């Protein structure tokens, strides 16, 4: 993509603003992000409804969170940090081959693409999610509060963290057992058997305990 190319659709695009919609901001920092050959682009708060097709190629870092976004154009090849939490997606495009960071939070997602090997931290709570497709084996942080699960996924000593507070998860599996101290589970306000609470209560606080730390409830 040439210079004229990418400034044409962006003024084009910066046209069909709304009231109160900043795209004039938006096509000033796509210019400064260009000119200046940066790896970074952020465009968030800026009340945009939509992004243009075409973004700078080069760029590493996309931040585009607390908009009013419904769709992604096609992301950058290059891509490794993907921020577009609070905004109003419905689904994600296919994910950038080597992305290591995905934050898209507080959106309306009810399905994810696939996840790259190369995922390293996800936050995607607060949407429609109903279940998850296979995890990187490279991910060591992965929130995903107020989703719709109903069950958790099947997972050297790294610190790993899984939030899974306020999903539909009715079964603590015998895998989560198998884990260690050094993986925590967040697993408040889920659809647990009244059982689970106590049990997990004397299992966890016992003297002898190994197994990962658990989070279970809201201080109950």
Same mark, same amino acid.
């Given at each position: 993509?040439?210079?004229?190319?990418?400034?044409?659709?962006?003024?084009?695009?910066?046209?069909?603003?709304?009231?109160?919609?900043?795209?004039?901001?938006?096509?000033?920092?796509?210019?400064?992000?260009?000119? *200046?050959?940066?790896?970074?682009?952020?465009?968030?708060?800026?009340?945009?409804?939509?992004?243009?097709?075409?973004?700078?190629?080069?760029?590493?870092?996309?931040?585009?969170?607390?908009?009013?976004?419904?769709?992604?154009?096609?992301?950058?090849?290059?891509?490794?940090?993907?921020?577009?939490?609070?905004?109003?997606?419905?689904?994600?495009?296919?994910?950038?081959?080597?992305?290591?960071? #995905?934050?898209?939070?507080?959106?309306?997602?009810?399905?994810?693409?696939?996840?790259?090997?190369? #995922?390293?931290?996800?936050?995607?709570?607060?949407?429609?999610?109903?279940?998850?497709?296979?995890?990187?084996?490279? #991910?060591?942080?992965?929130?995903?509060?107020? *989703?719709?699960?109903?069950? #958790?996924?099947?997972?050297?000593?790294?610190?790993?963290?899984?939030?899974?507070?306020?999903?539909?998860?009715?079964?603590?599996?015998?895998?989560?057992?198998?884990?260690?101290?050094?993986?925590?589970?967040?697993?408040?306000?889920?659809?647990?058997?009244?059982?689970?609470?106590?049990?997990?209560?004397?299992?966890?606080?016992?003297?002898?305990?190994?197994?990962?730390?658990?989070?279970?409830?809201?201080?109950?």
């Amino acid at each position: 993509s040439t210079y004229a190319d990418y400034f044409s659709a962006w003024d084009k695009w910066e046209k069909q603003a709304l009231p109160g919609e900043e795209r004039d901001e938006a096509v000033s920092r796509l210019k400064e992000c260009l000119i *200046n050959n940066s790896d970074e682009l952020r465009l968030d708060r800026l009340n945009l409804s939509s992004l243009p097709d075409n973004l700078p190629a080069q760029i590493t870092l996309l931040n585009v969170s607390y908009n009013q976004l419904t769709n992604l154009p096609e992301l950058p090849v290059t891509l490794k940090k993907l921020y577009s939490a609070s905004n109003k997606l419905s689904e994600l495009p296919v994910l950038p081959p080597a992305l290591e960071s #995905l934050q898209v939070q507080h959106n309306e997602l009810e399905n994810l693409p696939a996840l790259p090997d190369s #995922l390293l931290t996800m936050n995607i709570s607060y949407n429609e999610i109903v279940s998850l497709p296979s995890l990187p084996q490279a #991910l060591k942080n992965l929130r995903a509060t107020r *989703n719709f699960l109903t069950e #958790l996924p099947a997972f050297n000593p790294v610190v790993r963290e899984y939030f899974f507070d306020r999903n539909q998860i009715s079964h603590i599996p015998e895998s989560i057992l198998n884990l260690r101290n050094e993986c925590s589970i967040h697993i408040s306000d889920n659809p647990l058997s009244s059982h689970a609470l106590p049990a997990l209560q004397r299992l966890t606080s016992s003297p002898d305990y190994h197994g990962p730390r658990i989070y279970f409830s809201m201080s109950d």
